[PDB]
Structure 1
Amino acid sequence: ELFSVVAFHCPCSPARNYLYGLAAIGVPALVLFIIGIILNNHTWNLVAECQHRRTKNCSAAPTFLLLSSILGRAAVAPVTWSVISLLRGEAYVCALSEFVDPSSLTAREEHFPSAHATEILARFPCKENPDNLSDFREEVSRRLRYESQLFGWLLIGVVAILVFLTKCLKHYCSPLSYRQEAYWAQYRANEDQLFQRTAEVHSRVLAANNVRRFFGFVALNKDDEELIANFPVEGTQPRPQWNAITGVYLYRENQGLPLYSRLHKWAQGLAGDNVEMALLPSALEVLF
């Protein structure tokens, strides 16, 4: 399958293999880092916040925590890939093979040729080594593979502490108790599921009316007819109304009662001449 194509193949050439190791590991780490950014909706409403202000109005403090959460929720995929690629050991023995010093080599008498030291050392991962040097082939392989796995466990340990220190600092510096944030988290998940699901139903009901206005009738299934009957649409939501619920939000409290989202901020009525991108000119200009 794909694993056959993307299988690691060490090019046993000095000053050339670690470039391949950088590309065979650093590129999948980059791609998984990009995918984490794209899928995270918190990176788009941050863009939407910058889109409407156009003047860098927000300070660094609201952005610093917002930007940190985007990277942290997306850096997990490169780490769980960098760790596995380090515990495997293939990507590190290939990269650092030519840097091994023949002077410090042991487990065999000093038969190491000096005519081409780096060239022979770089050929260890591919087993293209003379049998007189085979005692060093397993000696060099175990030394480098140990450092590959040693770095892997330290990366897990450091990550497992940064996660602990981040969560501990998040709770201590937050203005809310850990239970209210738990309730707040259970609200945002419920709002997003409901908001997207009605947005699909609202479009279908609106689309049906447009189809009915054209063909004189709509071909609905059994369940779609219920959607039209149960949920009749009366119009469409203005663009500024949509723009009032897009962006970032940081727990603004109104009259002692918490607000948990911009939609909740808009629903309470705390969010809501010049016409842009109009279909037609001013009504007076339409006459002329």
Structure 2
Amino acid sequence: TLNNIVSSLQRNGIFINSLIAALTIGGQQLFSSSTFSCPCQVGKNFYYGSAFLVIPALILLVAGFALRSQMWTITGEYCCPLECKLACLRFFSITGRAVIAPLTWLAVTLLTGTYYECAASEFASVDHYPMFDNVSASKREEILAGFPCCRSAPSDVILVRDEIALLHRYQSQMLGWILITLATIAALVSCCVAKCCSPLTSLQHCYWTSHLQNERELFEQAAEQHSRLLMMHRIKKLFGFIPGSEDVKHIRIPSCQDWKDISVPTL
């Protein structure tokens, strides 16, 4: 009864997507809490933010795309009528499985907001503040870039720093919610257009998916058994018996040529 429920869960795409999202959330939390520290330099801040903000998303998207076995077969069908549309729907299902990880990464890393603070701590619009009128541009950038990591100045500085930080947190969380909403709407309309352009009815689709799955599994098992039988026959030609038999009555000692015979596997 164990493998029954195991396969029932494996079929559930919802469970797999939930597992992927939860693992990405935990990994993002650990990654941020462990190996993140603002450089607070003059020009090397925005890049340090955008790297952690963007690069893991691209990496996880590429990983979700390439790690899917069926994607390789589909590309091989494409790489050097109805088949085109069915391949399009297969590619669509693969993309739907893959997109979950980078999307949840972006969403969580924006809702936490600590990356955006260190990302755009230099573009802060400072125009109506009492302490930022006399200072030159260079020292202005210098004292503005020192806000995110630490604080050491009198109370007015920490007040304006908290204000700027709260503004940037608001901007980050708003961007995160906008991304969530836009992504959900896009996914919904994409599933809708996929249902619209599907040449199969509601029932033929189920049969088609089951057909693809069963095809891959059965061909794997059958090719395995066939090659096993062939190698067993070559072994019987070499030694003179079957590896599975018991109390073998004839044992043919190999000669110096039959080793050369078995050296090549005939591909």
Q: Which moved more, 1:68-77 or 1:118-127?
A: 68-77
Match of 1:165 in 2: 189
Q: Which moved more, 1:27-36 or 1:202-211?
A: 202-211
1:121 aligns with 2:141: no
Change (3 A) 1:208 1:169: same
1:206 is aligned with what amino acid? L
Counterparts of 2:115 and 2:244, CA distance in 1? 57
Counterparts of 2:85 and 2:152, CA distance in 1? 58
Match of 2:120 in 1: 96
Counterparts of 2:124 and 2:49, CA distance in 1? 16
Match of 2:131 in 1: 111
Counterparts of 2:215 and 2:54, CA distance in 1? 37
Q: Which moved more, 1:208-217 or 1:160-169?
A: 208-217
1:179 aligns with 2:203: yes
Deviation at 1:84, TM superposition (A): 1.4
Counterparts of 2:64 and 2:93, CA distance in 1? 11
- Tell whether the 8 Å contact from 1:30 to 1:78 is kept in structure 2 after alignment: yes
Q: Which moved more, 1:62-71 or 1:2-11?
A: 62-71
- Tell whether the 8 Å contact from 2:65 to 2:71 is kept in structure 1 after alignment: yes
Deviation at 1:162, TM superposition (A): 0.9
RMSD value, Cα: 3.4
Deviation at 1:96, TM superposition (A): 0.7
Q: Which runs of 5+ in 1 are unaligned?
A: 222-278, 280-288
- Tell whether the 8 Å contact from 1:129 to 1:137 is kept in structure 2 after alignment: no
Match of 2:65 in 1: 37
Q: Tell me, what secondary structure is at the counterpart of 2:65?
A: helix
Deviation at 1:114, TM superposition (A): 2.4
Q: Which moved more, 1:6-15 or 1:60-69?
A: 60-69
- Tell whether the 8 Å contact from 1:93 to 1:145 is kept in structure 2 after alignment: yes
Q: Which moved more, 1:138-147 or 1:119-128?
A: 119-128
Q: How does 1:39-58 map to 2 (within 5 A)?
A: 39-51=67-79, 54=80
Match of 1:83 in 2: 107
Q: How does 1:149-160 map to 2 (within 5 A)?
A: 149-160=173-184
Match of 1:202 in 2: 226
Deviation at 1:158, TM superposition (A): 0.7
Change (3 A) 1:18 1:201: farther
Counterparts of 1:220 and 1:207, CA distance in 2? 13
- Tell whether the 8 Å contact from 2:60 to 2:102 is kept in structure 1 after alignment: yes
Q: Which runs of 5+ in 2 are unaligned?
A: 1-26, 246-265
Counterparts of 1:25 and 1:64, CA distance in 2? 31
Identity of aligned residues (%): 36
- Tell whether the 8 Å contact from 1:102 to 1:117 is kept in structure 2 after alignment: no
Counterparts of 2:84 and 2:244, CA distance in 1? 51
Name the count of aligned residue pairs. Answer: 214
Match of 2:35 in 1: 7
More helix by share: 2
